[PDB]
Design a protein around this motif. Structure first.
Motif, mmCIF file in Angstrom:
data_model
loop_
_atom_site.group_PDB
_atom_site.id
_atom_site.type_symbol
_atom_site.label_atom_id
_atom_site.label_comp_id
_atom_site.label_asym_id
_atom_site.label_seq_id
_atom_site.Cartn_x
_atom_site.Cartn_y
_atom_site.Cartn_z
ATOM 1 N N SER A 1 10.973 -14.514 9.692
ATOM 2 C CA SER A 1 9.435 -14.113 9.845
ATOM 3 C C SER A 1 9.116 -13.004 9.091
ATOM 4 C CB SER A 1 9.226 -13.964 11.495
ATOM 5 O OG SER A 1 10.074 -12.881 11.895
ATOM 6 N N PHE A 2 8.057 -13.143 8.203
ATOM 7 C CA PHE A 2 7.670 -11.943 7.556
ATOM 8 C C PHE A 2 6.243 -11.843 7.487
ATOM 9 C CE2 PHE A 2 7.589 -14.642 3.705
ATOM 10 C CZ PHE A 2 6.667 -14.165 3.292
ATOM 11 N N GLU A 3 5.943 -10.609 7.012
ATOM 12 C CA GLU A 3 4.385 -10.217 6.580
ATOM 13 C C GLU A 3 4.298 -9.651 5.164
ATOM 14 O OE1 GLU A 3 2.637 -7.035 8.668
ATOM 15 O OE2 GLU A 3 0.722 -7.186 7.400
ATOM 16 N N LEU A 4 3.621 -10.348 4.412
ATOM 17 C CA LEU A 4 3.334 -9.582 3.111
ATOM 18 C C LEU A 4 1.815 -9.162 3.020
ATOM 19 C CD1 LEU A 4 3.592 -9.002 0.276
ATOM 20 C CD2 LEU A 4 3.791 -11.333 -0.473
ATOM 21 N N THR A 5 1.742 -7.995 2.896
ATOM 22 C CA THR A 5 0.373 -7.386 2.839
ATOM 23 C C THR A 5 0.104 -6.278 1.748
ATOM 24 O OG1 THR A 5 0.200 -7.212 5.421
ATOM 25 C CG2 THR A 5 -1.133 -5.665 4.197
ATOM 26 N N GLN A 6 -0.774 -6.930 0.880
ATOM 27 C CA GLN A 6 -0.944 -6.104 -0.443
ATOM 28 C C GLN A 6 -2.490 -5.680 -0.350
ATOM 29 O OE1 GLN A 6 -0.010 -8.331 -3.692
ATOM 30 N NE2 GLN A 6 -1.629 -10.016 -3.353
ATOM 31 N N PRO A 7 -2.635 -4.744 0.409
ATOM 32 C CA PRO A 7 -4.326 -4.065 0.455
ATOM 33 C C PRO A 7 -4.456 -3.394 -0.811
ATOM 34 C CG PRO A 7 -2.955 -3.669 2.260
ATOM 35 C CD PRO A 7 -2.020 -3.883 1.274
ATOM 36 N N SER A 8 -4.525 -3.839 -2.052
ATOM 37 C CA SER A 8 -4.717 -3.254 -3.432
ATOM 38 C C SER A 8 -6.215 -2.840 -3.051
ATOM 39 C CB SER A 8 -4.445 -4.357 -4.294
ATOM 40 O OG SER A 8 -4.796 -3.632 -5.589
ATOM 41 N N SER A 9 -6.294 -1.494 -3.311
ATOM 42 C CA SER A 9 -7.576 -0.926 -2.830
ATOM 43 C C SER A 9 -7.919 -0.352 -4.387
ATOM 44 C CB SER A 9 -7.766 0.250 -2.041
ATOM 45 O OG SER A 9 -7.003 -0.179 -0.685
ATOM 46 N N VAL A 10 -8.599 -1.086 -5.112
ATOM 47 C CA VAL A 10 -8.940 -0.681 -6.570
ATOM 48 C C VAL A 10 -10.375 -0.249 -6.481
ATOM 49 C CG1 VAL A 10 -9.248 -1.574 -8.954
ATOM 50 C CG2 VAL A 10 -7.555 -2.488 -7.505
ATOM 51 N N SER A 11 -10.529 1.162 -6.631
ATOM 52 C CA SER A 11 -11.976 1.769 -6.421
ATOM 53 C C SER A 11 -12.126 2.423 -7.736
ATOM 54 C CB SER A 11 -11.851 2.504 -5.236
ATOM 55 O OG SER A 11 -10.918 3.540 -5.341
ATOM 56 N N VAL A 12 -13.244 2.213 -8.377
ATOM 57 C CA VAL A 12 -13.949 3.025 -9.263
ATOM 58 C C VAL A 12 -15.213 3.817 -8.845
ATOM 59 C CG1 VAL A 12 -14.645 3.161 -11.768
ATOM 60 C CG2 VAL A 12 -12.708 1.914 -11.000
ATOM 61 N N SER A 13 -15.157 4.978 -8.566
ATOM 62 C CA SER A 13 -16.566 5.318 -8.098
ATOM 63 C C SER A 13 -17.006 6.775 -8.748
ATOM 64 C CB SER A 13 -16.448 5.758 -6.566
ATOM 65 O OG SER A 13 -15.361 6.687 -6.496
ATOM 66 N N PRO A 14 -17.325 6.896 -10.151
ATOM 67 C CA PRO A 14 -17.729 7.767 -10.806
ATOM 68 C C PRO A 14 -19.226 7.990 -10.686
ATOM 69 C CG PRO A 14 -17.488 5.878 -12.313
ATOM 70 C CD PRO A 14 -17.199 5.536 -11.035
ATOM 71 N N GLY A 15 -19.702 9.288 -10.208
ATOM 72 C CA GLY A 15 -20.935 9.855 -9.761
ATOM 73 C C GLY A 15 -21.079 11.113 -9.476
ATOM 74 N N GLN A 16 -22.132 11.930 -10.013
ATOM 75 C CA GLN A 16 -22.389 13.138 -9.883
ATOM 76 C C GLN A 16 -23.369 13.400 -8.625
ATOM 77 O OE1 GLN A 16 -23.033 11.625 -12.284
ATOM 78 N NE2 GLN A 16 -25.231 12.159 -13.085
ATOM 79 N N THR A 17 -23.121 14.475 -7.468
ATOM 80 C CA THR A 17 -23.957 14.830 -6.503
ATOM 81 C C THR A 17 -24.438 16.186 -7.050
ATOM 82 O OG1 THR A 17 -22.848 13.697 -5.139
ATOM 83 C CG2 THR A 17 -24.131 15.251 -4.124
ATOM 84 N N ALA A 18 -25.954 16.521 -6.710
ATOM 85 C CA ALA A 18 -26.536 17.494 -7.028
ATOM 86 C C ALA A 18 -27.871 18.023 -6.228
ATOM 87 C CB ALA A 18 -27.100 17.731 -8.488
ATOM 88 N N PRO B 7 -5.953 -8.288 0.897
ATOM 89 C CA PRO B 7 -7.380 -7.848 0.941
ATOM 90 C C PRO B 7 -7.657 -7.110 -0.336
ATOM 91 C CG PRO B 7 -6.037 -7.208 2.951
ATOM 92 C CD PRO B 7 -5.081 -7.532 1.728
ATOM 93 N N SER B 8 -7.515 -7.814 -1.490
ATOM 94 C CA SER B 8 -7.936 -7.014 -2.722
ATOM 95 C C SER B 8 -9.457 -6.646 -2.766
ATOM 96 C CB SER B 8 -7.678 -8.077 -3.739
ATOM 97 O OG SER B 8 -8.170 -7.375 -5.207
ATOM 98 N N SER B 9 -9.445 -5.154 -2.691
ATOM 99 C CA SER B 9 -10.660 -4.671 -2.650
ATOM 100 C C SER B 9 -11.203 -3.916 -3.851
ATOM 101 C CB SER B 9 -10.929 -3.562 -1.505
ATOM 102 O OG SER B 9 -10.081 -3.925 -0.299
ATOM 103 N N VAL B 10 -11.854 -4.751 -4.633
ATOM 104 C CA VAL B 10 -12.514 -4.304 -5.905
ATOM 105 C C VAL B 10 -13.791 -3.847 -5.967
ATOM 106 C CG1 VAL B 10 -12.654 -5.151 -8.387
ATOM 107 C CG2 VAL B 10 -11.009 -6.152 -6.957
#
Ligand SMILES: *[C@@H]1O[C@H](CO)[C@@H](O)[C@H](O)[C@H]1NC(C)=O
Ligand SMILES: *[C@@H]1O[C@H](CO)[C@@H](O)[C@H](O)[C@H]1NC(C)=O
Ligand SMILES: *[C@@H]1O[C@H](CO)[C@@H](O)[C@H](O)[C@H]1NC(C)=O
Ligand SMILES: *[C@@H]1O[C@H](CO)[C@@H](O)[C@H](O)[C@H]1NC(C)=O
Ligand SMILES: *[C@@H]1O[C@H](CO)[C@@H](O)[C@H](O)[C@H]1NC(C)=O
Lengths: 117, 117, 117, 117, 117
Positions: A1-18, B7-10
């Motif tokens: 019995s196994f779990e394979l969890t790959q929550p690959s969290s690919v985030s690109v959030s470029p932005g300026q706050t002013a 849960p690939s979160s692109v």
């Protein structure tokens, strides 16, 4: 019995706050007593421009400012009297990516449990 | 018995946030007492422009500002009297991507449990 | 029995934070007593520009400033009287990536438990 | 029984934080008593520019400043009277990455427990 | 029974923090008593520029300074009277990475328990 969890969290959030704020302040004037005599105020301003053969940029570029070409720029240059400029010229050019920018984001997680029992 | 969770979160969330505020302030004027005599105010302003052969940019570019070509620019240049500019010229050009920008986002998660029992 | 957890957290979050504030201050004027006599104020300003053959940048570049080409720039140069500039010329050009910038982000996690029992 | 945990935390977070503040101060003027006599104020300013054959940068570069090309720049040069500049010229050019910058981030964690029992 | 934990923490967080502040101070003026007589003020300023054949940089560079090309630059040079500059010219060019900068960050953790029982 196994779990394979790959929550690959690919985030690109470029932005300026002013937080941009101008307060013209307080100009408190009490009992301003004045006697002004200026007869015959006669300014003279001569602007002359001549161009035999100008030409613009033939190449490929991306820079965002007035500099790009040969110009005559005049701004508030010769105010003669009682000229007030409060937060007057605010030029805010926030550029994340200029011209000729290429974005290729590739997220390709792979999961292959080859289990033999 | 197994679980395969990918849960690939692109996420691509580019964007600017801005708090822009102008307060012209307080111009408090009490008992302003004045005696102004300015007979015969006679300014003279001569603007002359001549161009034999101008030409524009033949290349490929993307820069967002007036600079791109040969011009004559006059702005509030010669205010003669009592000229007030409060937060007057605010030029805010927020560009995320200029000209010639290419976006290719590829999310291709792969899950292949080859289980033999 | 096993767990395979690969919380690959691929984050690209480039961005500037700025608190920008102007306070024009306090200009407190009490009993300002004045007697001004300026008969015959007569300034003269002659601006002359001539160009036989100018030409722009033929190469590929990305630099965002006025410097890019041969120009005549005049700004608030000759104010004659009572000229006030409070936070007047604020040029804020916040550039994360200039022209010709290429981003390629690659997240490719791999999980292959090859288990034989 | 085993656990394979690879919390690979790949973070690229380049960005500047700035607290910018201007206080014009306090200009307190009490009982300013004045008697000003300036008859015949007559300034003369002659600006002349001529260019037979100028040319721009043919190479590839990315530098953001006015220096880039042959120009005549005049700014607040000859204020004649009562000219106040408070936080007037603030040029803030915050550049994280200039022109021709290439980012390639590669996160490729690998997990291959080959277990034989 | 075993645990394999590789919390590879790959962090690239280049960025400047700055607290910039201007206080124009206190200019306290009490009973300023004045008698100013300046008849016939007549300044003369002659600026002449001529260029037979100038040329720009043909190489590849990324340097952010005015020095880059042959220019005439005038700024606040000849103020004749009552000219105040408070925090007037603040040029802040904060550059993390200039032109032609290449970043390749590679995080590739590898975990291969080859266990035989
Ligand atoms: C600055 O922005 C933040 C949000 O990030 C906010 O909490 C704060 O009150 C803002 N201040 C001003 C003066 O705008
Ligand atoms: C700034 O924006 C934030 C939202 O992020 C808000 O909470 C705050 O009150 C705003 N302030 C002003 C002065 O605009
Ligand atoms: C500066 O920005 C921060 C948010 O990071 C906020 O809490 C603070 O009050 C701001 N101050 C001013 C004067 O804008
Ligand atoms: C400076 O910015 C910080 C947030 O990093 C904030 O707590 C502080 O009050 C700011 N001060 C000023 C004067 O803006
Ligand atoms: C300087 O910035 C720090 C945050 O690092 C903040 O705590 C401090 O109050 C700031 N001071 C000024 C004068 O801006």
């Amino acid at each position: 019995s196994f779990e394979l969890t790959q929550p690959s969290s690919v985030s690109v959030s470029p932005g300026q706050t002013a937080n941009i704020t101008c307060s013209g302040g307080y100009l408190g004037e009490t009992y301003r007593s004045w006697y002004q005599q200026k007869p015959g105020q006669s300014p003279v301003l001569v602007i002359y421009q001549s161009s035999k053969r100008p030409s613009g940029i033939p190449g490929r570029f991306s820079g965002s400012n007035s500099g790009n070409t040969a110009t005559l720029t005049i701004s508030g240059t010769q105010p003669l009297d009682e000229a007030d400029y409060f937060c007057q010229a605010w030029d805010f050019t926030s550029v994340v990516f200029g011209g000729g920018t290429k974005l290729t984001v590739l997220g390709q997680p792979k999961a292959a449990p080859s289990v033999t029992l």
